[PDB]
Design a protein around this ligand. Structure first.
Ligand code: CLA
Ligand code: CLA
Ligand code: CLA
Ligand code: CLA
Ligand code: CLA
Ligand code: CLA
Ligand code: CLA
Ligand SMILES: CCCCCCCCCCCCCCCCCC(=O)OC[C@H](CO[C@@H]1O[C@H](CO)[C@H](O)[C@H](O)[C@H]1O)OC(=O)CCCCCCCCCCCCCCCCC
Ligand SMILES: CC1=C(/C=C/C(C)=C/C=C/C(C)=C/C=C/C=C(C)/C=C/C=C(C)/C=C/C2=C(C)CCCC2(C)C)C(C)(C)CCC1
Ligand SMILES: CC1=C(C/C=C(\C)CCC[C@H](C)CCC[C@H](C)CCCC(C)C)C(=O)c2ccccc2C1=O
Ligand SMILES: CC1=C(C/C=C(\C)CCC[C@H](C)CCC[C@H](C)CCCC(C)C)C(=O)c2ccccc2C1=O
Lengths: 218, 66, 73, 111, 663, 75, 184
């Protein structure tokens, strides 16, 4: 798809592409706004239509060009044109510098028609109820945005919910020994792979002690 | 082979069944697993077998029923 | 080999967010493609707020319940 | 404004407010009360949205379905436009009735 | 891109929602911010106390009111307003003397009962409370520094093992610990504070109320009853003994949980786990909800028992103090009651983890399983009460308008009368077994009539409906049939669109917004009941079974002095009351447009106004609107602003009426 | 021939009710009270219980159906 | 020791006997036929209506209608004589203690209303059960509707027989419980 050369509306006064329209106060507010949206189309007959900004208009038998402040007005006019069997209309966003961005028929095929090369953006692979609970994701990446969680996080919190209901079989986290641990950070033994072995043996000692203590009055 | 929705659901079930058992163990360390949180205190199990364990009655756990 | 409930067989909806959760509805058709995630199509006598009386459910959200009976949803 | 409140809505409302058991003006006092009730009743429709009432209706419909009482004309709360229309109608009717009683009872007593 | 005019409202709508802060990353920051805010709030309270004490000391007449309290009137503070007449004399001043305001708070009786005799003592008290405000702010700074010092001590902290990260959860153990807090609150802050106040009474209050006596002997602890005849208040000896008993009981109770040692006391978690609870006690919203639900019975009983059993000297002799205190505390407890439900709903939205679908273990789970039954039965009882109270009131109104007072339906309040008879028999048996009998209990038991029965049914209706709205909002905050994803959204959000039938007022915050109107209405009913029975018990007892009596013999009749305040005949000392009356009517009606008229109309109106501004010669060359773009208030902001206007009008319209009617 | 649904795609149904443990747990250990998992059998065991006699019929005499209320508790 | 002044006006029975459990033994109330306020109120009613009557002509129809109204008022005075009214208002009271045997008791109206209200609800429920269609709710099957309306008289027995036999209620797992509160 080739973007056209839509000029800035303040530099294209009196263009032959402009349809005959009455002109109202509803048009884009100059002297305060510099971002304009332009919609172009090619018609077959001078059929009267309604401008999104109040007032009616008559197309041209050839090319047409209109400028609007908002993309919504351009899309409304596009739907109105498409109701009149007028395809091949393109909607551009004009930056303040004059950069032309091609917006509505982005890949050249209207969004209601399946086109190859598209990928489901903002897709979630479950029913809407499958979203994780907001309470589970507190102070994580998804603090108040449980609907933004990746499906792996949703499954992880679901498994956590499943686990944290069998209370008797849970493992209480041992209380840290603050007074005798906690040396200066430079005082470490390195041996990271040995540190997990130390984790294993210390947790084994904790579990054995807990079992021995429980097997006294239970 | 292509991953049918049934196969994805099977992976969901396998992952959940494995992880729900793994997180109960001594290798997950969640704040909800602290003392005073959901899990029982280390040496003082309150409810087992759906029956109040002897540790419920505190210092009376050593007393006889009679 | 047919998969899912038979056509015209009543099923109880197990989708928690469904408007017809724990209600019953006739099975219109079941899509036989294994790639379809929600193949079971169920129609209901009671329309939801969108005035729609039919919806497609997953294979694990219909339990083949008996007929509703007199004065029963 | 205090002059309007005191010498018009209070002093000149003595005829309508003290109109019980007085032969001609009993209905005017009663209609004054009813107009106040209707005007305040309109505020329930004016201030509230239909989603709360829809959820409450669903909660009640649970109890109805429990006892095999199924209204097949499914109970739905009033549409937003209808809620506004009902609120406006009750508001204007109640206020008009309040003024109506207030002016008519006083002029009937004085004459 | 930047913001629009709605930024101010958006920010101020969650200005204290510390959970919604952007820099806050952990429970440590949240808890420390909350603790510091608590310190600042305590400082504000202390400064307010010192303020009242100062103004009583400086711009007031405590030294003269204490001498002749029954006919005298206290002074709140002077009036310095340049808008008054620089000539003549205002109705609030004795000619050339300064302008004063009569205090309707009740601090004069409080200080007189507590043992104040001189202005100098009040001045020293003001100084001490300002000192305490300084101390509170310095404690806030101290605790901020201590927690930052723990954080810095994590620069010299490592467990030499991968379990070192466990210390993340214990950094705010100072604030989040529950057993120590419960033990020390219930013991010290309640029991020993009561015991210290008993000491204060025995050392000052009882010595500075009667002739000199023995060295504060144990004869200062009496068990008389109520309403000492001369001062028409409770015996100070009885009050000291009551505080002593409460202090001893709460001190004993405060040794329950395991606070400082692991070898003494039971843990709260183990207490809950073996009961019908085991809730998520780490939620701050849950704790806030259930302590607001605790301050509510306390404040409601404060309102009831300040009036029924007046504890302060000559408090019953003030016709305005007794009504103002009751109405104030009733409104405070209504606000706290609705707060409890609002924060329960916020707890369910934000801080509640639920099982998959069927594990009926949590109490909230069991409540949610049959929530429809709860709401349906609450709706049924609300409908019954409303139907049968309004219909009987309508019967009485119609049959009394038709010259037939004897055709009314007057159900004799037999159950309340039986309770009163049992309590009176108990009290009379207590009194008859005394060598110092002939005691009085003031309004502990009051004449109960059919009007009382109907008003109690109306109050029960209001409470039922308020609880209905709040409970429905809480239970369906996480999802209803209409919107089965409500826990994915915020606690307060605009709507769910016009489709699916239309979804205005769908959030749990909208349920709170609807319930606040019913809270205000129920409180208005309670306050009207109390004030009407206070003004004329006889006329209330006879003519209060028909609503026209409430409309005429109370509202229309008792509003005479207030409207006459300022007129074209002169002004009274009720001029401020009448002016505030009209201003609060204007505020109440002004919030109707924020509630009735909704956003889109106004957004179009603002677009038109902005068109004008961008079209006016000089404005367009200075202000294009790109910086702080004016926009209409959002939907939730609009509902909240209308609710604020309505609440302010309804609440603040009443005190002028109370002052005009009683004074 | 209808294919059997695999356990991966099976259904939970609603056999798990509020009177029994959920997916996997143990109920609260109440002291002497209604304990254990209830099952509907009142009316059936009422038709085997003795006490019915010829004064009123000869079969299990229970108008008002007070026996059956246990069986209804589940509904 | 004068409980009236001790409790600020209200008086207490001070006696524990079963004979005082009736409403008729209350010291607040008093039979209407010997109460001063009752006499004064109905005398004022008679006086006002009579004063209105004299304003019209003697032979007019309004005079006869006012005579009929006066007769109605006097009949009301003599009919409420046995009804209990307070010793200070004179307005007769309604008894809501379940007495069943006093003038103005609420037991008889309660029983009558409960019967007819259960009748209405049972007729509606029967019609809804026998017409399981929306078309039958907008276009009422009048013969079936009146059949159910007549059949509703036996509601206190049929409803209980349905309650105990499992034909009124439905298990919660067959109707929509409500909105989901969890899933993750
Ligand atoms: C008493 C309540 C009340 C009040 C005061 C207003 C006020 C207003 N409404 Mg409104 N409205 C209300 C109720 C009310 N409404 C209700 C119940 C509804 C039903 C939905 C509406 C529906 C409605 C619509 C649909 C429209 C309005 C409009 C207006 C505005 C036009 C009038 C105007 O500009 O005067 C000025 C405003 C005043 C309040 C006059 C008094 C001003 C004070 C006395 C003087 C200044 C005070 C001084 C500066 C003190 C400073 C403040 C202090 C902090 C220092 C105005 C802001 C219209 C509008 O905005 O168009 C322009 C409009 O379109 N209203
Ligand atoms: C009224 C309810 C109640 C109940 C059921 C219990 C029950 C219990 N308490 Mg307890 N306690 C209570 C009130 C109660 N207490 C009060 C009001 C206080 C404050 C004085 C305490 C202070 C207290 C302490 C200090 C300790 C207990 C302990 C215990 C346990 C051992 C019982 C024992 O040896 O006591 C005979 C037992 C579970 C002990 C325990 O097991 O703690 C681990 C323990 O150390 N309690
Ligand atoms: C709980 C207290 C309470 C409440 C809530 C109401 C509620 C109401 N009363 Mg009311 N009333 C009460 C107590 C109360 N009454 C008592 C105790 C009395 C003494 C008997 C009265 C006497 C009374 C009378 C005599 C009248 C009402 C009216 C009304 C209705 C006004 C509705 C409306 O839209 O007004 C909108 C308000 C206005 C349009 C303004 C009218 C009031 C002000 C003071 C007029 C001043 C005009 C002035 C030139 C400035 C106007 C500004 C302009 C821009 C609008 C409403 C039903 C009135 C009614 O039916 O409608 C007006 C009416 O006629 N009441
Ligand atoms: C144009 C209207 C107007 C204005 C601007 C003021 C301004 C003021 N009045 Mg005021 N007053 C007015 C009309 C007005 N009055 C009328 C009509 C009456 C009835 C006769 C009164 C009766 C009155 C009393 C009785 C008192 C004042 C006081 C005050 C001062 C309090 C300021 C303050 O603490 O802010 C604080 C503002 C807020 C907390 C509001 C936040 C929102 C202030 C100078 C007080 C005073 O003298 O203070 C020293 C005081 O006691 N006024
Ligand atoms: C005069 C004003 C008025 C009146 C009469 C009502 C009446 C009612 N409201 Mg309502 N409401 C009002 C104003 C009013 N509201 C306002 C201003 C708000 C703020 C938005 C609300 C918000 C509100 C909520 C949020 C709820 C109610 C509910 C109810 C019902 C309570 C049950 C009852 O008593 O039914 C008896 C019926 C009547 C007394 C109406 C008369 C019927 C004929 C005439 C007899 C009832 C229909 C609750 C409800 O639905 O309960 C089931 C409920 O959930 N109301
Ligand atoms: C939803 C129903 C409901 C509710 C919430 C209340 C609430 C209240 N009633 Mg009340 N009352 C009701 C129905 C209700 N009443 C009915 C139907 C009657 C009979 C006319 C009464 C008669 C009554 C009297 C005489 C007194 C109260 C009082 C009170 C207050 C104190 C609580 C108390 O003792 O009540 C008692 C508890 C109940 C009444 C609960 C019963 C609920 C059932 C389901 C209502 C229907 C019963 C049914 C009609 C019986 C039919 C019998 C028939 C088969 C023969 C409280 C505000 C007292 C009061 O306010 O004094 C200051 C008081 O003295 N009530
Ligand atoms: C067949 C008719 C019928 C029956 C059996 C019931 C039965 C019930 N309703 Mg109900 N209801 C009905 C119609 C009916 N309703 C209608 C038409 C409405 C719309 C106004 C409601 C609105 C309603 C609410 C808002 C609530 C109930 C509640 C309840 C339950 C408690 C009893 C109660 O509150 O009654 C009181 C009933 C009313 C106040 C509604 C008015 C009664 C209508 C007018 C009767 C209509 C009968 C119908 C015309 C019969 C025609 C027969 C003919 C065709 C042959 C109970 C299960 C409550 C609940 O769930 O608590 C458990 C509750 O909160 N109902
Ligand atoms: C007498 C006075 C009593 C009357 C006061 C009663 C008011 C009730 C208190 C309720 C306050 C809590 C509700 C609240 O803050 O949120 C009410 C809403 C909450 O705000 C909503 O929050 C949601 C997230 O939870 C979403 O972000 C919504 O977009 C946002 O609007 O707040 C606002 O909308 C405030 C708008 C108006 C702000 C005015 C600033 C006040 C400055 C003067 C001081
Ligand atoms: C709200 C807030 C807060 C606060 C509060 C407060 C606390 C306040 C205060 C206020 C205040 C508290 C104020 C004050 C003021 C004061 C002043 C203003 C003073 C002045 C003085 C002076 C100036 C002095 C002088 C002198 C000297 C120097 C010495 C000698 C003497 C003389 C006098 C000469 C907080 C923190 C919570 C936070 C948030 C916000
Ligand atoms: C209460 C309320 C409802 C619920 C109210 C409903 C559904 C009204 C319908 C109830 C019946 C059908 C009305 C029939 C008339 C009454 C039963 C009796 C009126 C006459 C009596 C005096 C006899 C809404 O649906 C609603 C929607 C949008 C905004 C606000 C609201 C709103 O405030
Ligand atoms: C009146 C009204 C408005 C208009 C009110 C607006 C746009 C805001 C009015 C603000 C007033 C005029 C004060 C403006 C503030 C001052 C300029 C001071 C500025 C303070 C900041 C610098 C913080 C709405 O936008 C609206 C939206 C939705 C439902 C109902 C309504 C509604 O009723």
């Amino acid at each position: 798809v080739v973007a056209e050369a839509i000029p800035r509306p303040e530099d294209l006064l009196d263009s032959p592409k402009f349809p005959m329209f009455e002109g109202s106060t509803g048009g884009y507010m100059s002297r305060s706004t510099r971002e304009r949206h332009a919609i172009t189309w090619t018609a077959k007959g001078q059929a009267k239509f309604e401008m999104p900004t109040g007032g009616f208009a008559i197309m041209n038998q050839g090319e047409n060009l209109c400028y609007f402040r908002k993309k919504e007005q351009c899309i409304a006019l596009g739907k109105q044109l498409r109701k009149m069997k007028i395809e091949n209309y393109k909607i551009y966003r004009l930056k303040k510098d004059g950069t032309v961005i091609f917006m509505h028929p982005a890949d050249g095929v209207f969004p209601e028609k399946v086109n190859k090369g598209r990928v489901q953006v903002n897709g979630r692979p479950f029913t809407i109820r499958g979203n994780p609970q907001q309470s589970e994701l507190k102070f994580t990446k998804y603090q108040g945005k449980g609907y933004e969680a990746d499906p792996l996080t949703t499954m992880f919190v679901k498994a956590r919910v499943m686990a944290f209901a069998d209370v008797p079989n849970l493992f209480a986290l041992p209380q840290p020994n603050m007074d005798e641990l906690v040396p200066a950070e430079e005082v470490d033994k390195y041996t990271r792979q040995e540190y997990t072995t130390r984790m294993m043996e210390a947790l084994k000692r904790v579990q054995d002690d807990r079992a021995a203590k429980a097997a006294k009055s239970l | 082979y292509t991953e049918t929705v049934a196969d994805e659901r099977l992976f969901e079930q396998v992952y959940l069944q494995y992880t729900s058992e793994y997180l109960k163990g001594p290798l997950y360390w969640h704040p909800d697993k602290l003392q005073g949180w959901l899990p029982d205190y280390p040496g003082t199990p309150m409810i087992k077998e759906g029956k109040y364990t002897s540790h419920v009655i505190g210092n009376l756990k050593a007393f006889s029923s009679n | 080999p047919w998969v899912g409930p038979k056509k015209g067989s009543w099923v109880k909806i197990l989708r928690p967010e469904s408007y017809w959760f724990q209600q019953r509805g006739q099975v219109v058709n079941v899509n036989q493609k294994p790639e379809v995630k929600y193949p079971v199509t169920v129609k209901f006598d009671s329309v939801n707020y969108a005035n729609v009386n039919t919806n497609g459910y997953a294979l694990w959200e219909v339990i083949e319940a008996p007929a509703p009976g007199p004065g029963e949803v | 404004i205090n002059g309007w409140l005191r010498n018009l809505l209070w002093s000149e409302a003595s005829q309508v407010i003290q109109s019980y058991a007085l032969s001609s003006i009993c209905p005017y006092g009663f209609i004054f009360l009813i107009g106040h009730f209707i005007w305040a009743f309109s505020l329930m429709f004016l201030f509230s949205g239909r989603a709360y009432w829809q959820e409450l209706i669903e909660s009640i419909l649970w109890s109805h379905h429990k006892l095999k009482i199924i209204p097949h004309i499914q109970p739905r709360a009033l549409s937003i436009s209808q809620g506004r229309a009902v609120g406006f109608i009750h508001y204007t009717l109640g206020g008009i009735g309040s003024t109506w009683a207030f002016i008519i009872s006083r002029l009937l007593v004085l004459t | 891109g930047r913001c629009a005019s709605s930024r101010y409202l958006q920010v101020l709508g969650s200005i204290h929602d510390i959970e919604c802060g952007f820099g806050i990353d952990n429970t440590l920051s949240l808890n420390l911010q909350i603790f510091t805010a608590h310190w600042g709030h305590l400082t504000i309270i202390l400064i307010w106390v010192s303020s009242n004490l100062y103004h009583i000391a400086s711009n007031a007449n405590y030294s003269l009111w204490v001498k002749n309290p029954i006919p005298s009137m206290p002074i709140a503070h002077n009036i310095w307003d340049p808008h008054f007449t620089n000539s003549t004399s205002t109705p609030y001043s004795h000619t050339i003397i300064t302008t004063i305001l009569i205090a309707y708070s009740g601090i004069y009786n409080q200080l007189y009962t507590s043992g104040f005799n001189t202005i100098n003592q009040i001045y020293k008290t003001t100084f001490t409370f300002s000192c305490l405000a300084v101390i509170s702010i310095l404690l806030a700074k101290i605790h901020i520094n201590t927690h930052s010092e723990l954080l810095h001590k994590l620069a010299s902290h490592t467990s030499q093992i991968p379990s070192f990260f466990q210390l993340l959860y214990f950094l705010d153990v100072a604030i989040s610990s529950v057993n120590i807090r419960f033990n020390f609150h219930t013991g010290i802050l309640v029991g020993l504070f009561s015991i210290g106040y008993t000491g204060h009474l025995l050392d000052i209050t009882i010595p500075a109320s009667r002739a000199p006596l023995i060295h504060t002997s144990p004869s200062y602890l009496t068990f008389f009853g109520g309403l000492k005849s001369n001062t028409s208040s409770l015996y100070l000896t009885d009050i000291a003994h009551h505080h002593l008993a409460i202090g001893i009981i709460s001190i004993l109770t405060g040794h329950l949980y395991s606070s400082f040692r692991a070898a003494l006391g039971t843990y709260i978690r183990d207490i809950l786990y073996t009961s019908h609870l085991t809730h998520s006690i780490k939620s701050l919203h849950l704790a806030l909800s259930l302590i607001l639900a605790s301050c509510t019975p306390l404040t409601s009983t404060t309102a009831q028992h300040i009036y029924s059993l007046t504890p302060y000297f000559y408090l019953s002799y003030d016709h305005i103090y007794s009504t103002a205190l009751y109405v104030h505390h009733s409104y405070i407890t209504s606000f706290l009651a609705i707060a409890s439900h609002a924060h329960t709903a916020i707890t369910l939205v934000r801080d509640w983890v639920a099982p998959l679908e069927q594990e009926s273990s949590s109490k909230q789970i069991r409540i949610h399983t049959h929530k429809a039954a709860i709401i349906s039965h609450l709706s049924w009882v609300s409908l019954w009460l409303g139907f049968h109270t309004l219909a009987v009131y309508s019967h009485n109104d119609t049959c009394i308008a038709f010259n037939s007072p004897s055709k009314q339906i007057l159900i004799e309040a037999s159950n309340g009368q039986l309770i009163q008879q049992a309590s009176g028999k108990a009290l009379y048996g207590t009194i008859n077994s005394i060598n110092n009998y002939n005691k009085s209990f003031d309004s502990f038991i009051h004449p109960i009539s059919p009007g009382d029965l109907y008003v109690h049914h109306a109050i029960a209706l209001g409470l039922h409906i308020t609880v209905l709205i709040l409970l429905k909002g809480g239970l369906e905050a996480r999802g209803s049939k209409l919107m089965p994803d409500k826990m994915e959204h915020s606690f307060g959000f605009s709507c769910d669109g016009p489709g699916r039938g239309g979804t205005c007022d769908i959030s749990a915050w909208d349920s709170f917004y609807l319930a606040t109107f019913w809270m205000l209405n129920s409180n208005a009913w309670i306050s009207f009941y109390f004030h009407y029975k206070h003004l004329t018990p006889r006329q209330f007892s006879e003519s209060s079974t028909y609503l026209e009596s409430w409309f005429r013999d109370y509202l229309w009749f008792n509003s005479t002095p207030l409207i006459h305040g300022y007129s074209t005949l002169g002004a009274n000392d009720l001029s401020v009351q009448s002016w505030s009356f009209l201003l609060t009517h204007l505020a109440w009606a002004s919030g109707f447009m924020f509630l009735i008229s909704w956003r889109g109309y106004w957004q179009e109106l603002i677009d038109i106004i902005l068109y004008i501004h961008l079209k006016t010669p000089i404005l367009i060359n200075l202000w294009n609107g790109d910086i702080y773009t004016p926009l209409a208030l959002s939907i939730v902001q609009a509902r909240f602003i209308g609710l604020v206007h309505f609440s302010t009008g309804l609440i603040l319209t009443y005190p002028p009426f109370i002052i005009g009617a009683t004074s | 021939x209808x294919x059997x649904x695999x356990x991966x795609x099976x259904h939970p149904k609603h056999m798990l009710v509020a009177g029994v443990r959920g997916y996997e747990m143990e109920w609260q250990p109440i002291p002497g009270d209604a304990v254990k998992y209830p099952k509907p059998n009142s009316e059936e065991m009422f038709k085997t219980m003795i006490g019915a006699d010829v004064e009123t019929g000869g079969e299990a005499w229970d108008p008002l159906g007070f026996h059956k209320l246990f069986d209804r508790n589940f509904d | 020791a004068k409980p009236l002044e001790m409790f600020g006006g209200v008086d207490i029975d001070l006696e524990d006997t079963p004979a005082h459990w009736t409403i008729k033994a209350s010291p607040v109330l008093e039979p209407c036929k010997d109460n001063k306020k009752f006499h004064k109120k109905l005398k004022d009613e008679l006086y006002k209506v009579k004063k209105n009557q004299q304003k019209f002509a003697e032979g007019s129809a309004a005079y006869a209608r006012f005579n009929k109204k006066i007769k109605m008022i006097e009949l009301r005075e003599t009919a409420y004589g046995d009804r209990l009214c307070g010793k200070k208002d004179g307005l007769p009271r309604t008894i809501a203690t379940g007495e069943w045997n006093v003038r103005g008791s609420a037991m008889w109206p309660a029983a009558i209303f409960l019967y007819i209200a259960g009748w209405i609800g049972w007729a509606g429920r029967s019609y809804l059960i026998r017409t399981n269609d929306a078309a039958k709710e907008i276009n009422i099957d009048v013969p079936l509707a009146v059949t159910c309306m007549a059949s509703g008289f036996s509601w206190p027995v049929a409803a209980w027989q349905e309650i105990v036999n499992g034909e009124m209620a439905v298990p919660n797992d067959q109707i929509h419980n409500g909105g989901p509160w969890n899933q993750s």
